Design a protein around this nucleic acid. Structure first.
Lengths: 60, 883
RNA sequence: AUACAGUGAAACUGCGAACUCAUUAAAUCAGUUAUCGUUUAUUUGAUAGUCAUGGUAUAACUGUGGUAA
RNA sequence: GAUGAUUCAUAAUAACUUUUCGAAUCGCAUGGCCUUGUGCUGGCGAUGGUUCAUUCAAAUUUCUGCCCUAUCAACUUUCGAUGGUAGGAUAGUGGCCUACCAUGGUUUCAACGGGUAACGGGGAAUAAGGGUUCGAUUCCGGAGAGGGAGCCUGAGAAACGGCUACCACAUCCAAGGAAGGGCAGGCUUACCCAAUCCUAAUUCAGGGAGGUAGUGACAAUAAAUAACGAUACAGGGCCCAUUCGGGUCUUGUAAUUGGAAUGAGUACAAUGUAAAUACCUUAACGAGGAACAAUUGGAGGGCAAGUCUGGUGCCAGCAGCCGCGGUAAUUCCAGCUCCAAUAGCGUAUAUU
């Protein structure tokens, strides 16, 4: 039944509606609230080649 | 009630369906199994032609349910009797398991699913993910499919949280010296780099740490619009419809690379020339077996009576068999009518198809043959050598001959021994073309999914499979640096696998060196070097130039070290406390088995897992220099004598549970920064080749063991060599070398009979190196007593020896007299009275210890047989003078 | 309830658990005996002289695991 | 010592046994002595156990009885047939079986054989409390519980149970293995042990034995669909007969009007029953268009600025939901008249 609800999924146009059905929940809410991406964080983070040397943020 | 899910999820699935690209979801929480049916039904509503099959890979136990139908329905009926369930009600998860076609597989049994293709894949347990399992499952997922990873572990969730809050920070809590999941951390970081990855919770809320978070729904596709590769397939199919009868097979080909390879093979068969060779090298999933099946069908259509196919085992070859069968069906051949199948009478082949007989027209045979067998190849028209990289190299060299050769090799295969032996086999192909003509075709277009698949690209980047060695223009311009100018540096593994792009490029170069160096590899080697506490990584660098200006350096040599000995025992005890002990020491156990020695358990040592040098640089001495620098580092010369220097622990800041409740380390480190522990010896365990044995002999290692029977894949016996560091007693090494020398003199009779005498004397000299390096001269070979001589040799046997010394008798009488005499000479108990030449001693060992025929020995020496007989006569004349 | 003592899951123990398809006229069936020719769980009536208390082996139950089952 | 009768009961003597059994048990009472020992032993009951009898069965056994037929005269030793001796077997008699030994046993009075629609017969069975011979009940006889074969547990089974091998189906699987045995329907439910009775350690539990209820016009039942009046108006109503005519006399009215009656129904209760339905009883409502709206068939007209056909004007025939406007438009042969059966009433075909 594609037009009708089967299970929980219901499709109207391009939208899909699905029924829903402590510290971990809090940190999941923190993950949802976080908008920054780990690739862009890698862009910020630099790396040292040796013990005492010029730290490079990105590869040349 | 009804919650509108995020628009990115259906957009991602439908984009994957439209572009024939796979997608990956990571569901975090307890209700991930509840969210699976939604993803599968979104797949099927996007694509009706999509494959329905689901794959479920789990480690130990299923997540909250069972796979047995009777057990499930019995539990449901008992729940009906208790009354907790309505008579006709089903959880959508339960209906998903009941209705859908799911193949359940363990992590260990990932070998079985290799042939199959699945619409959806579900990796239940994240913490046990290995690169081999990951590659094996993702290759099975077809285009447009979904790979779901379930994160239900609180520790993994906390690692993910800390890592995304701070990429620098890592979560390692209550962790002593043990396994640290650096590979899993690198996986989690790479998920943000992946363009087709969404990380969602159990309520299908999108976590913005994913790479696909800025995904947009594609415009709806046009039916007139087709991919350009499929358009070239249409053009090749038009040319195939013009052609006959090979056109049906060309249409059966799924890629243009398949079509080009098939046309090259058909051109070879149409030439029907014995000196022609076609070498097909393919990626995994590119239908090399399909191309060879079309090759066999085309040869049958041309009318080839003799088809010999060889492979290490027919389980590499059944795929070729059904591909051949559908080629036969396309031509017009039918089972039980015009062709018959005779399966294996051998039970170890598991009833594999060994014989294929074709009755229409002339008699035609397609037969599977053993790779080591080559004498039956004298009446061979067309031979397909499948997985010739997996076939040992001298076997291939013997296998070459005047017949049509179709070689199959797997470049960039998931097993890295495939691609490394493919590079060596490419070198041997360039040797082979220098006589017989050779044409090489390569396949890199996947049939299951679209080319340029983001998931395949991310997987190759993660596992470093597609890493290829490249010559350095800067090093070429500066010239080859001097090995004394070169220096050794420890690689910090945490910042090596911290997934920073500079470290990624450096790791790519080291993996390229690793694969291009050794011919045996596996994807699990990466997880081994990342997550093993005992393992350390060393790199040899060119001297640092100011003109580089902080540029990334290119490694020259790579050293992997595993610490095996008494220092590993405290970690093994911790592993036994936490369950399994994951194979700590190899050389201590092997030495304990071969030699009853309690002291070797107390001794601590380091085993070199792999030395890696660049193949482009030839005879640079970089490997030997690296071994010398490593030996000096373990002795302590690079280590500073003053202990006033701080330890400077460069471990990454480990977030604790209390820290959750409430700056990268250097990639390369100088040797003086870390002081190594007190290590007593160095060891290597390697397949015995002449070049490697010479290399370790020049590095002054001493053999203590040689494996009785060679490995099936390599064909070379395993040898163990030890080297004692200075300041440590070498008496145990001398005793081990002496007993190994006696064992080798005995074992030259059986399974070493195929060694050359030159390599045998090389092994004996490497054993005698320990006695030479021994400072004490008290131990020496006892002189042979006259009573002992009369015991071991008859007096009339000595008269016969003197008679053949006067040349009265023949060779066939003195043949009894030979072997015991050779054992005396190579045991050196007879003394230094008679000195033989190197060639003469090689002859004596070949006749006596190796039991070889003089014709074979003369063929090996490339010397006249009469000259060898005269040399042996001179040898025994010196023997008769000594007696 | 300073052995248990109320009510009692599981378990051990004991008792019970004796529709379809084919058509034979001394066969069946019906009576009639016999059992000085037989077997008895039960019911009923009888019946036995010829250490202040022996030794275990387990279930249910704990736990460690194998299997798709 | 019994018995019509014994080598039976019983009592001995010498032995024999993979040889037994002769309470190491349980709850209600705290008993009576004096010896106050904390000694003696104190009552009601459970569950055991030996043998014999009884009861419940059962197995064999005895004689008496059932169709047609010689277009069926020999049958039996053709699974030994008839006996004898001994043994094996069984719970036990026995050709039940096995050796050995004799030879017999059944009969034209029909042995023996065939057919029997032998869904048969049996006073088997309660009847037919006035159907002419009819009801109702009971025994059918056997075998099987995917199909051959072997085995086991019990007082009682060659078990509707289980086990092994074999043969054939068929199911799940991760392909390594694992488990299984149909009946109803067409051209199947719900309630319950209250009654009746049975089975358990037992009053209590349980019984798809058993009872109750539901969907299921059909063959066919007893009603109702109105009963009493009053007034006004009209002069004709009916019967017979070919016509001519004749016979007869309170009849006609789609006229008005009055109160009374009550069934269908609506519905309160109690009764009823394990519970409920139903039944019995039953307050309160329940008619004028009594719209609380009976059918089914038959006979005969009549009408137009209408239609068709044939003609020796104006006719004849066939017919006519159709006209000329109009569908909120029109109140028109007032809904044309009459007949018969009536919760029934027609047609077709066959047949006396």
């Amino acid at each position: 039944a594609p037009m009708s609800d089967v299970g929980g999924v219901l499709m109207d146009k391009d939208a899909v509606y699905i029924d829903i059905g402590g510290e971990g929940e809090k940190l999941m809410t923190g993950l949802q609230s976080v908008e920054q991406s780990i690739a862009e964080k890698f862009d910020g983070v630099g790396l040292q080649l040796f013990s005492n040397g010029t730290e490079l943020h990105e590869v040349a | 009630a009804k919650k509108a899910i995020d628009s990115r999820i259906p957009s991602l699935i439908r984009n994957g369906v439209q572009t024939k690209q796979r997608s990956i979801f990571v569901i975090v929480g307890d209700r991930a199994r509840n969210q699976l049916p939604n993803l599968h039904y979104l797949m099927m509503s996007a694509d009706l032609k999509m494959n329905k099959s689901v794959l479920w890979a789990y480690k130990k136990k299923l997540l909250g349910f069972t796979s047995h139908r009777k057990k499930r329905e019995n539990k449901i009926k008992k729940e009906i009797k208790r009354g907790t369930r309505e008579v006709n009600e089903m959880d959508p998860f339960e209906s998903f398991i009941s209705n859908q076609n799911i193949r359940y597989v363990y992590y260990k049994e990932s070998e079985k699913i290799l042939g199959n293709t699945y619409g959806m894949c579900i990796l239940q347990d994240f913490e046990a993910l290995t690169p081999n399992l990951l590659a094996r499952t993702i290759e099975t997922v077809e285009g447009g499919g979904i790979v779901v990873i379930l994160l239900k572990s609180m520790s993994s969730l906390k690692q993910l949280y800390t890592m995304t809050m701070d990429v620098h920070a890592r979560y390692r809590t209550e962790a002593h010296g043990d396994v640290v999941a650096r590979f899993n951390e690198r996986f989690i970081l790479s998920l943000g780099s992946n363009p087709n990855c969404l990380v969602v919770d159990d309520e299908l809320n999108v976590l913005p740490l994913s790479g696909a978070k800025n995904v947009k729904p594609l415009p709806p596709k046009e039916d007139d619009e087709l991919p350009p590769k499929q358009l070239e397939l249409q053009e090749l199919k038009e040319s195939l419809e013009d052609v006959q009868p090979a056109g049906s097979l060309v249409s059966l080909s799924k890629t243009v690379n398949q079509a080009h390879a098939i046309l090259s093979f058909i051109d070879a068969i149409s030439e029907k020339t014995l000196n022609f060779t076609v070498a097909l090298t393919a990626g995994r999933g590119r239908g090399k077996s399909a191309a060879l099946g079309i090759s066999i069908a085309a040869a049958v259509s041309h009318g080839y009576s003799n088809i010999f196919v060889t492979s290490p085992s027919p389980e590499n070859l059944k795929t070729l068999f059904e591909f051949i069968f559908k080629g036969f069906d396309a031509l017009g051949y039918q089972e039980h009518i015009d062709y018959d199948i005779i399966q294996s009478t051998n039970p170890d082949f598991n009833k594999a198809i060994v014989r294929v007989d074709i009755k229409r027209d002339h008699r035609q045979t397609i037969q599977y043959i053993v790779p080591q067998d080559h004498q039956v190849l004298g009446q061979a028209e067309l031979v397909v050598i499948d997985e010739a990289a997996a076939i040992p190299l001298p076997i291939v060299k013997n296998l070459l001959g005047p017949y049509l050769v179709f070689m199959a090799s797997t470049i960039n295969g998931y097993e890295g021994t495939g691609r490394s032996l493919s590079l060596k086999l490419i070198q041997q192909l360039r040797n082979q073309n220098n006589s017989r003509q050779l044409r090489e075709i390569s396949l890199d277009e996947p049939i299951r999914y679209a080319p340029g698949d983001p998931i395949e690209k991310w997987l190759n980047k993660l596992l470093c499979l597609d890493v290829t060695l490249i010559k350095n223009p800067r090093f070429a311009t500066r010239g080859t640096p001097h090995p004394s100018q070169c220096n050794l540096f420890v690689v910090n593994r945490d910042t090596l696998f911290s997934y920073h792009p500079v470290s990624e490029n450096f790791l790519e170069k080291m993996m390229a060196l690793y694969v291009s160096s050794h011919y045996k590899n596996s994807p699990n080697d990466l997880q081994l070097m990342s997550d093993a506490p005992a393992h350390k990584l060393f790199v040899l660098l060119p001297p640092i130039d100011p003109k580089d200006g902080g540029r990334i350096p290119d490694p020259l040599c790579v050293i992997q070290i595993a610490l095996e000995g008494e220092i590993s025992k405290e970690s093994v005890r911790n592993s036994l406390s936490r369950g399994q002990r994951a194979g700590g020491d190899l050389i201590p156990w092997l030495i304990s088995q071969q030699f009853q020695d309690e002291e070797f358990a107390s001794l601590s040592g380091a085993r070199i897992v792999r030395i890696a040098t660049n193949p482009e640089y030839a005879s640079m001495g970089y490997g030997s220099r690296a071994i010398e620098l490593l030996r000096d580092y373990f002795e302590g010369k690079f280590t500073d004598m003053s202990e006033d220097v701080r330890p400077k622990d460069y471990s990454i800041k480990r977030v604790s549970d209390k820290e959750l409740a409430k700056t990268l380390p250097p990639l390369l480190l100088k040797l003086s920064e870390q002081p190594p522990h007190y290590l007593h010896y160095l060891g290597v365990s390697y397949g015995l080749t002449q070049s490697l044995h010479k290399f370790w002999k020049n590095n002054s290692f001493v053999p203590v063991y040689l494996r009785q029977t060679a490995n099936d894949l390599t064909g070379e016996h395993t040898c163990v060599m030890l080297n004692v560091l200075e300041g440590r007693e070498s008496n145990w090494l001398v005793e081990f070398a002496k007993d190994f020398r006696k064992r080798f003199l005995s074992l030259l009779s059986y399974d070493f009979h195929k060694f050359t005498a030159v390599q045998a004397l090389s092994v004996i000299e490497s054993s005698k190196k320990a006695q030479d390096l021994s400072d004490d001269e008290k131990h020496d070979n006892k002189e042979l007593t006259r009573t002992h001589l009369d015991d071991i040799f008859s007096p009339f046997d000595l008269k016969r020896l003197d008679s053949y010394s006067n040349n009265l008798l023949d060779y066939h009488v003195i043949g009894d007299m030979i072997p015991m005499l050779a054992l005396l000479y190579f045991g050196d108990k007879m003394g230094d009275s008679v000195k033989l030449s190197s060639v003469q001693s090689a002859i004596l060992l070949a006749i006596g210890l190796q039991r070889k025929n003089i014709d074979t020995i003369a063929k090996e020496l490339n010397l006249p047989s009469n000259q060898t007989i005269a040399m042996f006569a001179k040898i025994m004349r010196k023997m008769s003078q000594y007696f």
